[PDB]
Design a protein around this ligand. Structure first.
Ligand SMILES: CCCCCCCCCCCC(=O)O
Ligand SMILES: CCCCCCCCCCCC(=O)O
Lengths: 61, 64, 252, 277, 277, 61, 252, 64
């Protein structure tokens, strides 16, 4: 089938950890949640300044 | 001056200052509780120390 | 001859001419915390020779009717040189420890002690309806002793030996790092305990990592005119001592 | 993958580097870390922000509504349910959604329907399993005025038929909004003359949802309680905002009563003494 | 794979080899076998310690709790369940876990919920299937004070909805502990002044678990009994210890009564004569 | 799929004995127990001595 | 801008937005004792971050009639965290120190202080016919102050400023590691002192390696309604702290 | 028990043991001298501390 093997979340016996998935429905809205999308970009809220500010330097000068 | 039975803590001032806000400065533990002697030992017995052995502390006894 | 052995930690050295090998914890030897297992971000302090040395505690007398004794660490070493000073000024601590129990007699005396290190030796109360007091669990370098009979104290520990104050069988304590001191063959016992805990580090006043118990299975005995005074001294030396969270000393 | 930043080992310092000094006036949040203001040790941090994901945060079934409807036609008891779909009547889920201004996602809807027999002196029955019918009516569709209205024919409106005992009915729905994203806040009106409806209700219109017993009638009065659950998935959120501080009063607007910024305490220097040997 | 050691064929002996002689003082357990103290034959031992595995030993559902909650609001009967999760109230499973000092593992939790109708003279009913709701509340979450509390909205707290008749509800949970391993024994306190709580309760805090009937009300009083089962999997254990000898008294500490080391008998030389032709 | 064939435990008709497995869930905590991990090292408890002791020799000398 | 600077030692960090560079002892920077210069055979202890951190002493008030102040180290730090603990338990010590004197006012105040580090600052007695008492030389973190006039004390130090209590000219103290705190340009003063002594190590209670003197050459002044309270705080952090000769703590 | 004005040293036993040689065990400093308050400061003066400030100590004064 259109099987798609992904990686499972670390277990309590770490340091065959993968699962299989197949969509049965025609609408993408039927698929399960995307609990594995780990994107980040705090810059939008933490550093929305026009002029890049270097940590080790004075904010104003 | 330490009350009875308390003992001075060399690392701290037994003094207080009257701040601008008419409040006395925060007091430290310049005077601590005097510790009682080590209860010792009871032959074929037990000493229960629920809350240390300093002044005001209590200890119970029992026999095996 | 594997009978003789020498131990050197810091400015202290112990000698033995009648030992029985050396038990090394659970097969592990004391080691500093690795970066892939650390949590505290601040750079730890490692006094080394300053705290990692042999500290001798108050000796104890072994009598024909002695039931046993027990110490709790690192609490028992709260007033020992700089090792105790770091416990006061730091929030977190981590150490190894090399337990060395001494006890000599003669080819005419007899008896057998059981030197054991019990991790998380949570103990019970004399009165099952009440709780125990820290004062009754551990009192500095002063040893608490087991009783051959039941105890009654309000907040005292059930010192009855047969249950080791844990509600278990004393004959099964051999499952912990241990050694025996069979006077007819021994003269001391050494145990190298590695840091054992469910956390990289922990407070040294609030938590008693392990308990050292010396329980005699063979009653001390001898004939007339034979030295009746047979003391049992305990010496312990921290290993790979690390400290984190420096702040104002804790008022005991 | 979603791992956290490690702490570089830092040593003594004495330079013109001022990472600790800054100016919040710029609206810039300091990007300082422990290693910048003290001596730190290297630490391989394996922690992960995997559960902080907007997906994992909002993707959990939460109750959004609940109504009761009876079987027999006695007194003035409603024999069917009606509901103008929205998630503003349940403070819990409503508060989460309101952490963001706009949202976009598909959704998993689950229904927990339970029945009972109203108290009585002589109520000995033997009623077969109760079958329910939940019908969704998008804006404009004909609305039923009785438990026998022709509207229940479900000719084109999506509907579910469930019998008690079986697993709670469920079904997914896409992104309905006619806009490019659902709007949790609408600082505007419905009319160009700046009047009429103000806020959410001014534009949101997900239609209505009706329920009923398909069973003709029960010997003695019985009632059922349907609980609707929402679980957004394939989530997208924009423009974060200050969480709700004042309790929710109305489900149609943001009205509130002046609430305290937080709990009180003795003084600014008050800190409970928890160390008392 | 997990096979047992075979017995090498041994013959007569007469040397300075002393495998039988040793010294327990070293704390070393003799590694002697039959072939060392007698003449043995070769034996291909196929036995396996496959069932002695810590995994196979602890990985078996064991009851950890049980409470009863009623449907009607009559008298002072609790209509919902509350429970501060822990496995110290059931001696069986508690004794196994306590064979080790520290533990690490995921867990499979199963619930066995059963209901009944309290006795009465006139109790003729016809109640539909009873649906239950089990909600887990991690430390800090809002706790419900009634069977109609807003907390049951389960906005983010994990919750299960189960109807009688179906297979007992189940679900897995990872390794929650904030430490690197669960602690069965904690010879320490909760406060730095060495006071307050002592032992397990001083640090363990898995939160609470609540249950209830989602059904509005029953004509006549009925009650349900929920039984929680734990089944650790993907197990890891450290520092083994002496099994519990004294009976368990409290579920908060290790208090006990001086118990006998074992059963008694006539004398050290007593051995029952079982051969009497 | 991400099928993984393993070996079954001996049956009462020994002396096709393998099973197939596929993980359906995204979390490793959802997987079945590891009833086939046969590791051992009694040394930790039976021989935690610093100096290796040879059976056929005297414990002390 | 070289005006702003940041200092980080251990778990302490100092900030400045009006400094004047940094004086580094006699061109040297603190360093541990090398093997080709060591004498004590025992392995030294190096607490590092535990003792090498910024210790703030009791602040002092600068008044229009203030003549000066002075501190003696390492004595002045005998009760400072673990740095003081190592002084008690060890016979020998060796450290660097980073002196940081703070003192801010306003563009409307005026005055000029002289922060100096005087090695072996042997001082004289008020009564030239008698001797001085340690109690009058250094008293913990409590600062001794210079007087604008002659002193008379029995075993007191000749606090008369003009002679700096050493029988020399104050205007020549600039020959020692120093900096000024000219309020109209400054805000603080930092000096990194390297271990200076005629011996690899030395006792820290018996010997006062160096004296920190803060003498104002420009009297503090200001107009009405201008903050009259102008404190002067001193912060110092040990560097490359080494210790030898571990034994029972010394009873002060 | 500490005399006046002395204070107990927590690190030591205020107890003595009668040895086999009929000699009392060596005594430690279980009781030390109580320290006096910091003399303070004399405006345009000096305080001479020849021998500390503990009990029994003396201090002289002078003016610039
Ligand atoms: C078939 C049932 C259809 C139900 C539609 C529900 C749509 C929910 C949209 C929520 C909008 C919002 O929260 O801003
Ligand atoms: C969703 C239900 C969560 C239940 C958490 C149970 C955690 C059990 C931890 C047992 C700890 C121990 O036995 O030492």
């Amino acid at each position: 089938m259109g099987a798609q093997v992904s990686t499972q979340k670390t277990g309590a016996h770490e340091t065959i950890i993968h699962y299989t998935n197949i969509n049965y429905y025609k609408d993408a809205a039927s698929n399960s949640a995307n609990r594995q999308d780990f994107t980040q970009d705090p810059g939008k809220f933490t550093e929305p300044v026009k002029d890049i500010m270097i940590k080790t330097m004075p904010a104003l000068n | 001056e330490c009350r009875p039975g308390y003992r001075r803590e060399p690392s701290l001032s037994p003094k207080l200052t009257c701040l601008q806000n008419l409040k006395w400065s925060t007091a430290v533990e310049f005077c601590k509780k005097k510790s009682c002697p080590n209860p010792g030992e009871i032959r074929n017995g037990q000493i229960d120390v629920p809350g240390g052995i300093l002044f005001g502390a209590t200890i119970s006894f029992s026999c095996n | 001859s594997d009978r003789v052995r020498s131990l050197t930690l810091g400015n202290s050295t112990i000698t033995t001419q009648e030992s029985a090998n050396v038990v090394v914890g659970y097969g592990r030897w004391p080691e500093y915390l690795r970066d892939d297992e650390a949590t505290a971000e601040d750079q730890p302090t490692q006094p080394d020779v300053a705290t990692c040395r042999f500290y001798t505690l108050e000796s104890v007398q072994w009598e024909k009717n002695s039931a046993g004794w027990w110490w709790k660490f690192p609490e028992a070493l709260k007033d020992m040189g700089l090792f105790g000073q770091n416990m006061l000024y730091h929030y977190l601590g981590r150490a190894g420890y090399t337990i060395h129990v001494q006890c000599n007699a003669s080819k005419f005396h007899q008896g057998c002690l059981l030197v054991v290190c019990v991790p998380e030796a949570e103990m019970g109360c004399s009165q099952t309806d009440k709780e125990v007091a820290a004062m009754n669990l551990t009192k500095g370098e002063a040893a608490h002793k087991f009783e051959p009979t039941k105890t009654n104290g309000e907040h005292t520990v059930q010192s009855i030996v047969c249950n080791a104050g844990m509600g278990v069988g004393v004959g099964n304590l051999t499952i912990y790092p241990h050694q025996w001191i069979n006077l007819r063959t021994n003269n001391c016992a050494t145990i190298v305990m590695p840091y054992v805990n469910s956390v990289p580090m922990d407070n040294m006043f609030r938590h008693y990592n392990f308990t050292l118990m010396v329980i005699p299975f063979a009653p001390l005995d001898y004939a007339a005119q034979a030295s009746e005074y047979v003391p049992v001294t305990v010496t312990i030396a921290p290993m790979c001592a690390e400290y984190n969270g420096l702040r104002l000393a804790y008022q005991q | 993958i979603a791992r956290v930043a490690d702490t570089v080992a830092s040593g003594p310092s004495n330079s013109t580097s001022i990472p600790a000094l800054t100016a919040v006036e710029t609206g810039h949040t300091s990007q300082v870390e422990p290693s910048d203001t003290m001596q730190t040790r290297h630490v391989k941090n394996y922690h992960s922000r995997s559960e902080s994901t907007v997906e994992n945060f909002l993707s959990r079934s939460a109750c959004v509504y609940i109504e009761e409807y009876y079987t027999k036609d006695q007194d003035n008891v409603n024999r069917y349910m009606s509901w103008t779909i929205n998630a503003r009547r349940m403070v819990q889920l409503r508060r989460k959604f309101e952490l963001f201004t706009y949202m976009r996602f598909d959704m998993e809807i689950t229904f927990v329907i339970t029945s009972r027999q109203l108290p009585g002196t002589s109520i000995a029955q033997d009623m077969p399993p109760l079958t329910h019918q939940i019908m969704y009516i998008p804006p404009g569709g004909p609305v039923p005025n009785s438990v026998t209205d022709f509207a229940w024919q479900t000719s084109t409106n999506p509907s579910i038929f469930w019998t008690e005992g079986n697993a709670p009915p469920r079904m997914s729905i896409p992104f309905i909004s006619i806009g490019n994203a659902y709007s949790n806040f609408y600082d505007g009106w419905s009319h160009f003359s700046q009047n009429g409806v103000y806020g959410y209700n001014a534009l949101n219109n997900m239609g209505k949802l009706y329920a009923r017993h398909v069973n003709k009638d029960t010997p003695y009065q019985m009632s059922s309680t349907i609980r609707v659950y929402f679980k957004p998935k394939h989530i997208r959120v924009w423009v974060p905002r200050p969480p709700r501080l004042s309790p929710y009063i109305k489900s149609s607007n943001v009205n509130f009563n002046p609430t305290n910024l937080t709990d009180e305490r003795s003084s600014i220097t008050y800190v409970p003494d928890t160390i008392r040997p």
